[PDB]
């Protein structure tokens, strides 16, 4: 997730590293990469629920 540009549309996103997919798995649903933060690397994303 951290290697993707901001605003990209993704699916089957992991909540944790190695989780193997937790978010945006239902049909027609997706997750939006809102922003990045390198210092203590964390990515903010938008879930289908908003």
């Amino acid at each position: 997730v951290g290697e993707m540009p901001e605003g990209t549309i993704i699916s089957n996103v992991e909540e944790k590293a190695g989780d193997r997919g937790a978010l945006g798995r239902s049909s027609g649903n997706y997750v939006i990469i809102v922003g990045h933060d390198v210092d203590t690397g964390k990515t903010r994303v938008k879930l289908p629920s908003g």
């Binding site: 540009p5 605003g7 549309i9 049909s27 027609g28």
Partner: protein, 93 residues
């Protein structure tokens, strides 16, 4: 003969379930039971099987496509594909 003024494919439902619901189902089933063109073969032979799977027959290009519930491609997916294409070009260049 026209055989149907407006119900069309929903004539199998008779008079029940409501007119608005029948109209919405009529639009969905018209999209669902439609032959589409294979983006690799150029033949109008793509048909739906089990709500999201689209296959076209023939001697070649027996591919199985992951599409929408009743259309091969949805507007949201096309917009996402364009957005991802744009982002990939910016990253590459």
């Amino acid at each position: 003969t026209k055989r149907t003024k407006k119900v069309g494919v929903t004539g199998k439902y008779g008079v029940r379930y409501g007119a608005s619901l029948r109209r919405d189902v009529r639009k969905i089933e018209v999209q669902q039971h439609s032959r589409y063109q294979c983006p690799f073969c150029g033949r109008n032979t793509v048909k739906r099987t089990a709500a999201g799977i689209w296959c076209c027959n023939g001697k070649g290009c027996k591919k199985v496509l992951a599409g929408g519930a009743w259309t091969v491609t949805t507007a949201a997916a096309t917009s996402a594909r364009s957005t991802i294409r744009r982002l990939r070009e910016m990253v590459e260049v």
